């Protein structure tokens, strides 16, 4: 490299630019553009021995019955022969509310007294003006008029109808008080979702004065959120400060245009009250639009970091060129990612990696330019080739290790089981490696190519540079030596507090919300302010969510859990079923299945509801449907000779459908037969007693004990292989478990590689262990701060844990390699010399990414501000901790005890 | 309980509307993906047309299948000794107009057993009674009943 780089940099510059442009063209030509359709694109784990079973079950539910020639496992359709050939006064509510329709909750202003009657009239009129005043396909339109089909679906409509008026807005408000008393007396009653199309009700009527199909609505679906069961006093009449409004229309992708054009720019609703929850179903839809638009904050970031890079070294052109180098590295890495390895995915986080990428990049260039200036300081009138050789010898390996650290960090993050982070890991890792190599080649060339009113500004630059110089020259050593215990004690205490907040106090916890509702936007944005603050305030939602949902046991026999889905890093697409090599027909086979149901009828988790006829195992169902004579199939043993069995199975199940057919929609115990006549799979299920929690431990206890039992098959040779298959709906469980285990093992690999490279660089065990103490304290205090800010684990803030270690060791490695100029004292002069030598280097290398992430912060898409805050914290801590601590501890230890093997390496 | 007159829509609004009907989504073939959604009725009490001999009527949407069975059992009560006749449930040859709901399977045109006239007018209102979505007196030859689909 140095051989012919001497005054011939144009060749390498040109070949690099050609490489860049050709790889860019190939990347935009051959592979298919990324989707960005759904943020939760690849969260479902793969190859985790449960997600294996789970994905097989889902793949099975896909290839369900097709009426004629289903052409898969489902059913018996082959035997089709069968031996033969408002503005209105009343009655005004078309339907009852449900989750399907779109909705919006309203919050009051400082008035905070929501039962204000102008509050109600304003509510309805502003709603209609803000929503209905637009081209709308319409609503159910029970009458001919498509305008006042469903009027606003508001409580104002209710109070109007109790007033029995064709017009909602006209409200003298006396009936408001009447119905207020009525609602009190009704909340006293616990009062049903009666039909009540007429006044008479089949169930017992608590009081006729309760208007039919009205009070239950306001109490259970409508604006009332505070559960309205206080028993305090009439004076204690609350305001119901939260109020909800259903849209007369229905929620779906269509409403996207309406919200975008009609409901964003609006600063609020009105001074009487304002919107706070906008649940229109369309969250994932416009997501990518906000993503695209809100991307100028990374632009402000890259421009300000370019500016401060200029501030560092006045060689503006060098700054621009290395910035372009970073970007081109991103591009060629993308090309390598999608193309070179034939695997493709792009899980929305690679559009956040770029920030830490450019951070590490700008980091690795500062060291090089400063080493260049240092070697140019002494013997400047030397050979350019020799200058290149020496500055390379002194900086290239430093660059290589200080990047390969995070490189190995990400190539370790690869080990997890989430796809949506396997991809991120591989991409960013190749990115950082290519960044390193492109730097070590490109940057030397462009550097050597730099052959080259303002006076007062230049003077202030000079003076401030000297100020920084003296600051790093006297101040910092003075501090660290003059205390030499204060920082160390303070940081021991902070490590204690971090370990404490992570261990027993409100600590790192797994996700809580359901899979499809990960808060993807800024928590202050209305769409998700709906969740986590309002969804748990509504009778229908809350009393519906997390209630008497006995999760089902389940078992399969026809298939085998082979995820033919691109196992190593699937594309979050691609599955295919198969068949086993069993035969249900054997007498011992059905006998064993019967006895199996028998044994399972004795267990703890069971729940003998005693209302089923056809939902449990169908063998007993045969048994009951047996002893049916004169058709002919009857008067036999409970096992069968496989012949009566084969003739009777299809006959009987078809006769069950013929008596009164009940849909069997690929969830039922329905056995599985194929296009031609043969049963192939034997699905059957049950009912547990665990009530479908979300926290880990309960689910784990459940699944562990259940699979523990079912693993004991001990069946006969037929259908005896790998048939265990117990699988509930415990997908969320699987995500959670693998997320925890993945972040753990990834952190492990990262600290391992950090310590190993620390050995391979410093060759001293002692200072390596001290750096380990350092980085451990750093990660502890930073994750403690995170959890203090209430940040559950997700797909995103998992990789942050592991990348924190790589980012952290980046400073300890310098302060370690800087143990030169061996003085008389074992401790005193060496550490202050190292500090004074690497001060500005490390400080600027931190402050760059700090200010980048800092200006990044205010945005909308969560991922951006998430990563911004994380990097701000990790950089601040890593710098301050690294310096103060890893010199303080070193101030009180003598590292002259080491182990050296070969003096050949240099650095 | 009236003999629904000529050209009378019961939901009071055109078919392709979100009121009880929604709108058409996609074609269906014998090999399409979404074709799994369809199931055969095979209720022996009903007589099918099957002029295509491929079961164009004998299969339909399960959501529509249950409603049709409801109407069958409900009209067996009010009219004894009748055998309902579905003329076209799901069309793939294209005997109906393009973009028609019959191509989707959420609809079927229904006639009585012995091709009676006033029985059509009463049977429309009956189809309303069983809980059908968009029952329209499409033709003098057949009563047209169309349902919404789930999901
Ligand atoms: C557009 C990018 C992606 C590719 C090309 C970037 C560089 C290779 C270009 C941009 C600016 C160019 C420079 C612009 C101006 C000059 C000064 C010029 O000076 C003289 O000829 C000296 C005259 C004298 O003093 O007698 C020599 C070429 C040079 C260094 C050029 C060399 C090629 C450079 C560095
Ligand atoms: C300014 C550069 C040098 C650095 C930052 C790059 C980002 C601004 C780029 C990189 C990835 C880009 C995204 C890649 C893929 C897509 C999908 C793409 O989808 C469509 O085109 C479908 C919808 C439509 O037609 O608009 C829309 C742009 C978007 C979001 C892009 C938005 C702009 C992004 C975030
Ligand atoms: C060799 C030099 C250039 C260093 C390369 C470092 C990385 C770019 C390597 C290290 C591990 C590699 C991965 C190891 C294994 C696989 C699985 C491979 O697919 C399979 O093996 C599918 C199943 C099979 O056929 O066995 C696709 C490439 C990939 C992701 C590799 C992509 C490239 C990776 C990340
Ligand atoms: C994992 C991969 C991507 C790392 C690639 C790193 C290379 C670009 C670096 C690492 C070691 C470097 C070498 C380290 C030492 C030397 C010897 C140096 O010459 C001398 O030291 C001889 C005179 C003297 O003894 O002072 C010339 C540069 C060279 C070949 C360096 C060239 C650039 C090298 C190969
Ligand atoms: C940066 C490093 C050094 C510390 C933080 C990373 C992990 C070591 C942390 C982050 C999330 C933590 C987990 C968060 C929640 C739980 C569930 C919790 O559940 C129970 O108490 C049930 C019983 C059981 O799990 O055995 C057990 C600890 C565990 C797995 C924690 C173990 C420690 C984890 C993996
Ligand atoms: C004493 C000096 C050297 C400290 C230098 C660093 C501070 C200026 C940084 C460190 C941590 C930062 C804080 C980290 C996170 C946040 C949360 C942020 O708000 C959110 O992210 C809210 C998200 C949610 O609603 O959950 C507002 C800024 C703040 C307080 C930051 C303010 C600036 C702080 C204090
Ligand atoms: C001695 C100080 C001045 C300098 C050295 C330490 C600072 C660089 C950092 C280290 C850890 C940081 C703290 C990490 C986390 C938090 C919690 C954070 O809490 C909240 O904003 C939310 C509080 C809540 O609502 O519970 C406020 C900032 C603070 C104290 C940070 C303040 C700045 C600190 C002390
Ligand atoms: C509660 C009440 O009086 N509602 C009235 C009703 O009495 C009257 O018959 C109808 C016709 O004007 O208008 C409404
Ligand atoms: C701005 O918001 C306030 C409520 O904070 C509202 O009263 C005002 O009308 C809004 N501005 C405009 C121009 O409507
Ligand atoms: C199940 O347990 C009950 C109570 O111990 C016992 O009466 C019954 O016989 C058992 N049945 C089977 C099939 O084990
Ligand atoms: C199914 O069995 C029939 C015999 O009834 C045979 O003609 C057909 O090829 C078989 N198809 C498959 C996929 O095995
Ligand atoms: Zn028709």
Residue numbers in the entry:
A (entry chain D): 181 to 265, 285 to 389, 400 to 661, 687 to 865, 873 to 1148
B (entry chain G): 39 to 189
Kindly provide excerpts from the paper associated with this entry.
To further illuminate the mechanism of hDisp1-mediated Shh release, we generated a complex between hDisp1NNN and the native, dually lipidated Shh ligand, and subjected it to cryo-EM analysis. A comparison between the structures of hDisp1NNN-3C-cleaved and that of the hDisp1NNN–ShhN complex reveals conformational shifts of the two ECDs, whereas no substantial conformational change in the TMDs is observed. However, our structure reveals an extensive protein–protein interaction between hDisp1 and Shh. Resolution of the cryo-EM map at the hDisp1–Shh interface is approximately 4.5 Å, precluding analysis of the specific interacting residues. Although Shh was palmitate- and cholesterol-modified, we could not resolve the two lipid modifications, and thus any protein–lipid interactions between hDisp1 and Shh.
The membrane protein Dispatched (Disp), which belongs to the RND family of small molecule transporters, is essential for Hedgehog (Hh) signaling, by catalyzing the extracellular release of palmitate- and cholesterol-modified Hh ligands from producing cells. Also uniquely among RND proteins, Disp activity requires Furin-mediated cleavage at a conserved site in its first large extracellular domain (ECD1), yielding a mature Disp protein consisting of two non-covalently associated fragments.
